[PDB]
Design brief:
This is part of a larger assembly, with 2 copies of chain A, 1 copy of chain C (about 130 residues) and 1 copy of chain D (about 100 residues). Chain C has one domain (about 1-135): Nucleic acid-binding proteins (OB fold (Dihydrolipoamide Acetyltransferase, E2P)). Chain C has no helices and 9 strands. Helices cover about 0% and strands about 45% of the residues of chain C. In chain D, helix 1 crosses helix 2 (about 75-100). Chain D has a single domain (about 1-105), classed as Gyrase A, domain 2. In chain D, strand 2 and strand 3 (about 60-70) form a beta hairpin. Classes of the chains: A alpha+beta (about 150), C mainly beta (about 130), D alpha+beta (about 100). The interface between A and C is medium-sized, with 35 and 35 residues. Chain B: Belongs to the RNA polymerase beta' chain family.
Chain lengths: ~150, ~45, ~130, ~100
């Protein structure tokens, strides 16, 4: 389009960010499709331990402050979940970190209780990796899927 | 509403009434400048 | 600040479809009531059945800014024990009268204690340094 | 007198005024040096954050972002990681020369 009465209306009315929910039922129509689904089942899994140099790489691999992805102009991180034998970060703690940077700093974290598509008995005895739990913007339980 | 070899000469009325013609081809369905089309391709880095 | 301390008798080590993480069911040796369900990184800290661990939940180590990898001459409470984790409490379930349970999640590796007196010292804090000796 | 001012470009939109947190932009580089440089920069005891990132596979660009703790700017810590990567390539060249002269 060729004038500012149309640039303003492709940026505010017909942009993709406002088309997140469809008007037929209010269902969301935008999300990751095939192989990002099958990587969160490995990344947010409970085997997924990352060392420190690997932790800093995956954060800056996805979030770059030059493009404007952070809200804090400086990447903030988390303390590791394992201190003594070797410092390691868990894969659910990367999802906590990327939500820590893209959400605005003033508003508190997201509190969410949900479910996965993956039953608890596929993980073993007494696993609780079907109940997804976010508590103040921190993924504390359960893998992430298409759901 | 005239007589025609097989398909006679179009009159000014019959230049108007189908998907083609005038009133749907060139008034609801105009062609535009400043446009382009192409095959699309996947990209996770945008 | 030490918050909780006991000695637990490990009864089950279940790998359960994981190569690095085992679930540990341990009942205590002094108190006859308090149990322990814990997920430990078994590649760093190998646990067998019929062991005896010293679980200590601490509030901090001895109001700084953040974490920083260790350097010359720093000395901390983690140097006493063999395995330290860090994480939050998210759920305080009351089972019956005087069986008040707590729920810790150490970045996705869960823990459930179950006791009665620990309302003196188990708040739902963002900080719960959990430590294991022996 | 002719230097080259396209090869490295500090991005002031993400550079702290303290200087202790900067984001550089190399041209014509990729995983070759950007993974070798990220390794050697993270051995500095003053570095708090380091990671390389290629924004898109098409353009030959490379962003590395150094954040230090203090008393050393990220420009000052970029160049220690370039000398120790220069010093590491001389060790490998000095060992691989001996063993050819050991056969």
């Amino acid at each position: 389009p060729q004038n500012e009465n149309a640039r303003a209306e492709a940026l505010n009315l017909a942009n993709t960010d406002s088309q997140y929910l469809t008007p037929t039922s209010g269902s969301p129509v935008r999300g990751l499709i095939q192989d990002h689904i099958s990587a969160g089942v490995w990344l947010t899994s409970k085997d997924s331990f990352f060392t420190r140099e690997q932790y800093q790489q995956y954060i800056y691999g996805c979030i770059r402050p030059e493009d404007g992805h952070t809200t804090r102009s400086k990447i903030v991180t988390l303390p590791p979940t394992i201190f003594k034998p070797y410092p390691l970060w868990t894969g659910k703690q990367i999802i906590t970190t990327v939500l820590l940077n893209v959400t605005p700093p003033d508003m508190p974290g997201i509190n969410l209780i949900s479910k996965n598509k993956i039953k608890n008995e596929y993980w073993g005895k007494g696993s609780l990796e079907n109940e997804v739990l976010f508590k103040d913007g921190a993924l504390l339980c359960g893998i992430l899927d298409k759901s | 509403k005239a007589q025609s070899g097989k398909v006679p000469i179009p009159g000014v009325k019959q230049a108007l009434e189908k998907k083609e013609g005038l009133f749907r081809k060139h008034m609801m369905g105009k062609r535009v400048n400043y446009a382009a089309r192409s095959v699309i391709s996947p990209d996770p880095n945008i | 600040n030490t918050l909780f301390d006991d000695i637990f008798q490990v009864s089950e080590v279940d790998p359960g479809r994981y190569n690095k993480v085992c679930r540990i069911e341990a009942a205590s040796t002094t108190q006859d009531q308090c149990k322990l369900t814990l997920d430990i990184n078994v590649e760093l800290f190998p646990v067998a059945a019929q062991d005896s661990l010293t679980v200590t939940i601490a509030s901090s180590l001895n109001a700084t800014r953040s974490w920083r990898p260790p350097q010359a001459g720093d000395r901390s409470l983690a140097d006493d024990y063999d395995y330290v984790m860090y994480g939050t409490a998210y759920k305080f379930e009351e089972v019956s009268k005087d069986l008040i349970a707590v729920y810790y999640s150490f970045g996705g590796l869960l823990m459930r204690l179950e006791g009665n007196y620990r309302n003196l010292n188990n708040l739902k804090q963002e900080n719960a340094y959990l430590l294991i000796r022996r | 007198e002719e230097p080259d001012r396209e090869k490295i470009k500090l991005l002031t939109q993400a550079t702290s005024e303290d200087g202790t947190s900067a984001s550089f932009q190399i041209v014509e580089e990729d995983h070759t040096l950007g993974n070798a440089l990220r390794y050697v920069i993270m051995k500095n005891p003053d570095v708090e954050f380091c990671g390389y990132s290629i924004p898109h596979p098409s353009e030959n660009l490379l962003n590395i972002r150094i954040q230090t703790y203090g008393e050393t700017t990220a420009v000052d810590a970029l160049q220690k990681g370039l000398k120790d990567l220069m010093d590491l390539c001389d060790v490998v060249e000095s060992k691989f020369t001996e063993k050819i002269k050991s056969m």
